[PDB]
Symmetry: D2
Subunit: 346 residues, 4 copies
């Protein structure tokens, strides 16, 4: 089969031909219908050799949707042809966190050699992919695969981040979304669907601010030195109940600390190495909590899919072939994909 | 009446004679039965002239218990002689936070000129004190006033901090308490009363570690460079579900970050100017939230009092006269009060 | 001033002339801009003499909005002219429930002689009204008073009921609303604003089903013997995550028990004497909780007002003068007010 | 092997000899170390032929602990010899409830033919037993199996019931426990470990009231016509925050409704056919919720085991051999087991 792989440190990923895998016991083989590109893949490919630990070659793609092609020995609960989304952050399944479906916060996975697809195990940017266990598949019915693939991370991650503090976001609350890309543009729509928060979007790029308004942001503010004052102006001096920072640069985290309300929340979701919130007296308001959330839970993925099926998430995508995979990653690096890049194998 | 006041910047507080106040409409005059000394009073007295904003002179004492002496015009809900604790963090009473009793997180108080007793308004270290409103008194019944006075901050503040994350502290959880002084020694006992968490206490002083074990800590370990490794040894490498840092120095916050579990919590309660947690990817575990909580809520103070009345809180105190007030503050500076210093007026 | 009062047991309320009150210390006098009619007023007026305990005469109206006219001695936090809504379920202000703003669940109010406006103390169906304390006023800014008055109960009560189980109502959930009247039509809109629940409305009247669809219900079905099967058909046999019964008759509670999901909720909000859910093994699904909620909290009223100010609540009203007050109550009895009746002085 | 089976409708269970089973793929064979008797087994054996639906013969025992004897094909996560408790309420593992570990509330199990051990599938009252999947085992380490077996239902069920409303049970709260038998005597101890509630126990039998005090009840009241007034006397007229009714007869549910506080809770846990709470205006206080909970969740079972391992649960048992199984069930019927009956195979 055709796949897109990261094959040597510092180089662009390449289109390859590798064997179509066969499922062992408990496993499922999917025919991939859509594979999302996430900016996390760029963080991974930019790691120096000393930091990089996922093995070479590596089939990319941690956002995967497909149809069941072959059942491994013992597998029931899915039929051949079933449309499924892949739950990404694989855990041990047995610990206290995993028993609640919170496999994103499993502490045993590393020691057991469990790695996620596209980030240690073979990903979804290929004609076919293996899934380790039935509990890591979620049915999607007749959902369009292209709009469905991003739900598995661009949807799941903001959904989880928002869910951690959803009781704060009552009528009268304000939520700030910093970064209107793959994650951010879905985050705005989740906020609108599950809360009565007023949503203020923040981005460097005017066209992303337009995207923000298109998907339901109440206001849009230019990022940078003026953002904090502009946000406070909109919130009448009380600040924002919650800030969801999908950039996570030091400048955006600083903006978040300068606008968050007393007894509010900052969720540092975007990854920028070295950047951090400074949580201490006189540097942040009383009662304003800060966290770096990771991925999401099994039941949260089901909820994201339910939002999509109810028509609550308009996922903005651009489609690419497998051959266009390396080019699509260049587009993501330069910031020219309006929403989520998705590879459709054929 | 006799009172202890901070009268000039940089100097020790002094015993003074000032008029016994009379309550205006809505106010209550208390005969003070006990007034706690909090290390926050030392932070206040160590502020340079440029930072200090509470006015001079200032009657100290933000931990107050008394008996109702005189009702101001229009006051109902209390009779002369009723034993009451003073709710410290006065708010506007009208905003969304105050409507839930969360006057500790009121955003309107500053602009309305509302200041707390002992920290802008006259405190409890005097024979008598004014309380602005009936809603800032809580009945204590026959509770010993000396052990009751610390409940209003040494009790309330750890109670609130713990309450923010109480659902995390189920059976199998571990809570670390850093700093076994006024706040910390009460915090250990709250954890034992309201959760099934295993409690690990941390302090510089071996006698405070003994205090920790006396009030129910399951383990007590020496603070400093070795503390993080010793705590991890006790938690089997998973780390601590929650860390309540009642010191809040950079070294203790660093210890907290090095031991906190995935999806855990650090509560930075102690105040050490410039110290802060660094909340960013690779600097803290995924899902570990951090906050600087402040004081507590009206209903939380009632719950603290209920714990005391049920025999769940053994409050360690040393008693001082009003004349010994300045000496008691020197004792607090040097770290020689085993628990909470309390002034009893006579 | 002119007021509408219940004056003798069994009779219709009457328009009267009574003195304009003056505020004592701590009190506020409002010029009333809008006063809602609630079907609870009909329950009260239909009480026999033995049951009725609110005193005669009684100025009706537990849904009140006004402008501050006079401050009593010592009152701060409001200026003359401020537009305010009245928080209805007055409590002692001092107990553990009241300290959290949950004065709707205060246990001390009765013994202290605290009664709510329109239900023991003088209500809002008058040119002016007294409010006991500043904490029982909530600012409404430039909100239209006519659409604002129902927020104080038609809004507050469903808001509280929904709020008790809001964490159940995630994406993929279903909420059933039984009774699309004053309360129900606002409840549909609250569900849409604060949850991703799919909303199924139930009513006897086809025009109320149309109202339900107008304010955002995803489906609207006829009440009665066929309702339970029709709801199950819509939910694919799993049933409804939550049922908010704003009728509360035995037949509607039975429908609720026949459709509620495992680990779901029934909120019995409407009042029908003797009617009750039967909560026991084999009579209801495992984990399905049932409650009769009452009114709402201080912070909940603020949230309802915030929803109204954000344009999330389209409150359907019909306006009446004080003189038309008795006629408006006849209209409410016969079921001919499409939404909430409101009296404007 | 030797087993205790229900073999014909209306008759006592009998000791039998049946083949030692072999595990299919995904299954685990346990050597049973302890098997609890639950009063639910008596409800089942008292069902008329028309109602009874679990098949004949049926190996009894839905409270099971053992050691792993043989792994079925593909099973990982356990070694031969590991001491484990059996999670009883088996679900499909795939639905939204099961994804959160809430297999007790799975809606798909019936249609998929999934039945629990001792209640449709073969139970633990035998030398060996099959478990369907690894996710239905929980490690117990060196816990005494005899005291561990009741944790799987006598522990789990009260734990879940209490957990549903744990945020109500703050300092100052009161919890009533009706019925101090297998479940009730563990329920008292859970309340003491995870809350600061004052605990009032209610039973018909004075010796069970003594048991209640032995395991930490603050007060003990005789059940019957006087119970409601005696409970109100103890709660000062406000009533009980929560009532956990482990009898569930109409008389005990009536007592519960007559004592529950405004904004409180009644949990109807015990099963008595036809008995029900009457939830309507003027028949129950405002805001007092009522529910019939069922069993518990995967993570809750882990928490119960963690309580046992921390020394928080003193489980009162009487031990029986397999041959004494039928006699033990007669003892349970007549109410002469002081706590939980447990069968130890040899
Ligand atoms: N925590 C997790 O579990 C998790 C999961 C997935 C992705 N991520 C991270 O989320 C981040 C975003 O990923 P994506 O796929 O949405 O990226 P993207 O490239 O699709 O979107 C980036 C967006 O951020 C905007 N942006 C960049 N700098 C900005 C600034 N200073 N101020 C305001 N806006 C700015 C861009 O204009 C663009 O709109 C990445 O760092 C990614 O690694 C985290
Ligand atoms: N956040 C709030 O609302 C709030 C409220 C009250 C007090 N506080 C703050 O809490 C802190 C504690 O106040 P207190 O009155 O309990 O003080 P205290 O002097 O009574 O107790 C201090 C304790 O901390 C220990 N300690 C000091 N340095 C340490 C270190 N590096 N490692 C371990 N232990 C150490 C001491 O040995 C002593 O036992 C103060 O900074 C105070 O201002 C905060
Ligand atoms: N719990 C509380 O705190 C509280 C507060 C306020 C009002 N209430 C009660 O809520 C109930 C509704 O109040 P309202 O002011 O909205 O009444 P309303 O007269 O405005 O509306 C009643 C609606 O119910 C519908 N209806 C009547 N019987 C029905 C049935 N069997 N099935 C389906 N629909 C039916 C009508 O067609 C109408 O649309 C009343 O019983 C009132 O006393 C309770
Ligand atoms: N909801 C569930 O998931 C679930 C799970 C397990 C058991 N159960 C049920 O819980 C109940 C208790 O089970 P168990 O095994 O502890 O029973 P058990 O026979 O060990 O204990 C019964 C206890 O209740 C007491 N009692 C009986 N009638 C009483 C009354 N009127 N007032 C006060 N006390 C009374 C007895 O004196 C005894 O102490 C049974 O009905 C059982 O079927 C329910
Ligand atoms: K919404
Ligand atoms: K405890
Ligand atoms: Zn990603
Ligand atoms: Zn795990
Ligand atoms: Zn202090
Ligand atoms: Zn305030
Ligand atoms: Zn009403
Ligand atoms: Zn009250
Ligand atoms: Zn059982
Ligand atoms: Zn299931």
């Amino acid at each position: 089969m055709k796949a897109v792989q990261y094959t040597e440190i510092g180089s662009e990923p390449v289109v390859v031909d590798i064997p179509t895998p066969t499922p062992g016991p408990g496993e499922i083989l999917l025919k991939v219908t859509a594979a999302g590109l996430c900016y996390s893949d760029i963080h991974v490919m930019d790691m120096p050799a000393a930091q990089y630990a996922y093995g070479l070659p590596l089939t990319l793609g941690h956002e995967g949707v497909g149809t069941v092609a072959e059942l491994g020995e013992g597998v029931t609960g899915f039929g051949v042809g079933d449309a499924v989304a892949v739950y990404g952050p694989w855990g041990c399944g047995a610990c206290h966190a995993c028993a609640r479906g919170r496999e994103n916060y499993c502490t045993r996975a590393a020691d057991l050699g469990i790695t996620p697809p596209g980030l240690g195990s073979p990903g979804s940017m290929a004609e076919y992919m293996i899934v380790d266990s039935a509990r890591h598949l979620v049915p999607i019915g007749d959902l369009d695969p292209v709009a469905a693939a991003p739900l598995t991370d661009a949807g799941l991650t903001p959904y989880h981040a928002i869910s951690r503090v959803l009781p704060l976001l009552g009528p009268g609350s304000t939520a700030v979304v910093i970064g209107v890309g793959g994650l951010g543009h879905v985050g705005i729509q989740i906020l609108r669907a599950v809360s009565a928060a007023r949503v203020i979007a923040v981005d460097l790029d005017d066209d992303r601010l337009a995207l923000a308004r298109e998907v339901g942001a109440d206001a849009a503010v230019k990022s940078g030195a003026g953002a904090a004052d502009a946000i406070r102006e909109l919130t009448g001096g009380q600040g924002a109940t919650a800030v969801f920072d999908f950039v996570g640069a030091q400048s955006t985290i600083d903006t978040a600390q300068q606008v968050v309300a007393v007894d509010g929340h900052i969720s540092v979701v975007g990854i920028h190495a070295g950047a951090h919130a400074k949580v201490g007296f006189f540097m942040i308001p009383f009662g304003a909590s800060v966290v770096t959330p990771f991925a999401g839970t099994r039941s949260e993925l089901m909820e994201v899919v339910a939002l999509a099926r109810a028509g609550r998430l308009d996922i903005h995508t651009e489609t690419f072939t497998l051959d266009e995979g390396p080019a699509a990653y260049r587009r993501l690096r330069e910031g020219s994909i309006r929403g989520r890049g998705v590879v459709v194998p054929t």
